[PDB]
Amino acid sequence: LRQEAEQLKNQIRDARKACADSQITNNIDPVGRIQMRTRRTLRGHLAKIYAMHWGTDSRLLVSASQDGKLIIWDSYTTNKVHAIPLRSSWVMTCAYAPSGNYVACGGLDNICSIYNLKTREGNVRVSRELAGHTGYLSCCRFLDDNQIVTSSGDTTCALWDIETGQQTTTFTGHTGDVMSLSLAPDTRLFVSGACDASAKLWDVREGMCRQTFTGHESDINAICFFPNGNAFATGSDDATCRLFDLRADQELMTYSHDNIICGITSVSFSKSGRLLLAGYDDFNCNVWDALKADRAGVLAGHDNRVSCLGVTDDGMAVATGSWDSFLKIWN
Amino acid sequence: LSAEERAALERSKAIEKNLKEDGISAAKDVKLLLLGAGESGKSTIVKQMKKTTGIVETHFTFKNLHFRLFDVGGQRSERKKWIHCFEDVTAIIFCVALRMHESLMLFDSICNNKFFIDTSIILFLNKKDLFGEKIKKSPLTICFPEYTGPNTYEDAAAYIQAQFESKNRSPNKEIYCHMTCATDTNNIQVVFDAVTDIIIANNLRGCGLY
């Protein structure tokens, strides 16, 4: 009865193809020449860095590097609030609690580590050691102060409970390494990447994937939710950013350019959802328009590749940081 | 410029000083990563040293050089994604033994990459007594084309070593080799010699004058 699957697939193909009919709102003015400049130089790290996150105060950002140290900077005055020494040196992700009391990170150790900030003794320490996965971790997010959502290399995504310390549920079905899981603003749905050019939305309560989007040719590496909580964009090693809408169930705007031949490492939207930031595996940070489909924004520096970039909740500034151990704040 | 952020800033400077001290202390050692393929490989080497489902790091001590050895053995996930972080590592270790010789092309695959190129490879042939006792008997075969060589023994071993090599398409690579019988303690010494040699080569390449 496997042929029924490939006939149903043609059915849904015709369905999506018919539900759509580029040539709309093209008359709007272009964003124009957009240029950002460096305002701060966060130069505390020693080795390559991978990920960073913004707190809800839009003041403190935490980044992780191969040296195994987490730094809570003061973006205003370039100070160092805390320096956490890690147990496992190899890390690929970090996360900041919405309440600002906890910080979490994980990597090749296959265990998510959660830290505490506010304490009587005035020193940071571990809280829980989540150990359910058998593969390398990719990213962690906080649904709230009590629940964490993570995505490992076992083609599986699991939701935990810090106080319980056990996997309350597990999501699976991607049949490939899942990377860069980003929560939605509604904090009730999310979409995760995969190694087979596939993206799936998931339900935080029911426990099964709702939709499965396709259409890309190679591995994808980044994904993030739109501010409206009704769309998302995905980056991939094919130097292409593709925008998908759950309502449309089809790709909307394929950003491309002949000159660029590289990959993609991280993406993030803007406060109003008009600037589509991205970080390439090159010596720049390419910036694209929301739906006008033009390679407008370009950012020079720094020397090495680019790994991560994250926009603040309020949009006052943007942050960057990569393998050269330097972090720049562009305003 | 205000009372208390003056204290905050001096705290920040103390943190920076402590961080720099820790970094200069930590970067002093040397790092070798071994990713033996297949089976019957790296187990003997890791056993020759004198909470699961994760990479295991082994720390060594030899002539005031303690070594940090990482083996991604339990990683069931794809190599391309987590393989890259090891970029700034002095030497790699390669173990093979003794058909099912896809390790031959795997060696070529790891030796040729868009990054990671300028690194020497220390490959081991840890099963030598087994091969010898297999070659006194005539399997023979050899299931290779145009071998056209003497059956036993050093001739066949040298032909094998010529194979599985010569795929270095770049200069300034110093591929090493050894004949391990899974019963000798010389592995640490030859590893140390290879490390010392690559450090000297590196230093010479640095102005350089190379």
Epitope: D74, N123 | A3, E4
Partner: single-chain antibody, 233 residues
Framework: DVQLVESGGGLVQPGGSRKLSCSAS????????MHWVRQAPEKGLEWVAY????????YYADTVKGRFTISRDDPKNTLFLQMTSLRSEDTAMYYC??????????????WGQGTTLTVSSDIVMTQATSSVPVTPGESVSISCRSS???????????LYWFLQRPGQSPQLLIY???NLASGVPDRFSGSGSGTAFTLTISRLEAEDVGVYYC?????????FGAGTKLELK
């Protein structure tokens, strides 16, 4: 939890010598800046001296220079303060207070027990009156008159409040005159303007009666207000 035990005081003849030791436990003492505060046996508060967490910065009060010295040793978790050439005015009981300074910090959070000691410009704030009759279940208002505006360019208001239980060590109520300290009921709420400072207490109860104090941190040296005491008539 955190405990501060100090015992180094005693009746010393004027012109003699003595040393003070405040023992710290239950927290990372090595990463905290430490404070000395004395209280007169009848009334009044004042700042004695302060030592940085890294011990790279030292301060003393106006009438302390040349007579008293301070020093701390991290491995011993104790602070050393030397009383030299003590005067007849020095007869007062002391307090050793911990502090910490970074973004979003709450200094002077925990106070010690104190020692008994006997013998034989800068902005100043005043509180008046020092005694108001109150009733349970009724909100009260407290104000501390200040000399110079404390609103720094950083958008902050460097001022702190305190409450001393009758016969017990004082503890903090509001830090930076706008926030809430840990373990404090939400009824309390600091307020005030750049120069005028007001304290608000809603639903006062019979266990919150005591003496209030106002203290500024914009510039060294520190200073303390006259204070206000309540009653349950």
């Amino acid at each position: 939890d955190v405990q501060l035990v100090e015992s180094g005081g005693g009746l010393v003849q004027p012109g003699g010598s003595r040393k003070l030791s405040c023992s710290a436990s239950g927290f990372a003492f090595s990463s905290f800046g430490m404070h000395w505060v004395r209280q007169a046996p009848e009334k009044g508060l004042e700042w004695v001296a302060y030592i940085s967490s890294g011990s790279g910065t030292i301060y003393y009060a106006d009438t302390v220079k040349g007579r008293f010295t301070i020093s701390r040793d991290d491995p011993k978790n104790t602070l050393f303060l030397q009383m030299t050439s003590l005067r007849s005015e020095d007869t007062a009981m002391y307090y050793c207070v911990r502090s910490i300074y970074y973004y979003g910090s709450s200094p002077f959070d925990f106070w010690g027990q104190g020692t008994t000691l006997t013998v034989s410009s800068d902005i100043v704030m005043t509180q008046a009156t020092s005694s108001v009759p109150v009733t349970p279940g009724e909100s009260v208002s407290i104000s501390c008159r200040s000399s110079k505006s404390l609103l720094h360019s950083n958008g902050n208001t460097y001022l702190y409040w305190f409450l001393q239980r009758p016969g017990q060590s004082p503890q903090l109520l509001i830090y930076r005159m706008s926030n809430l300290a840990s373990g404090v009921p939400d009824r309390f709420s600091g307020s005030g303007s750049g120069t005028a400072f007001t304290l608000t207490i809603s639903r006062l109860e019979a266990e919150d009666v005591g003496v209030y104090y106002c203290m500024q941190h914009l510039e060294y040296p520190l200073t303390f207000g006259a204070g206000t005491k309540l009653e349950l008539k």
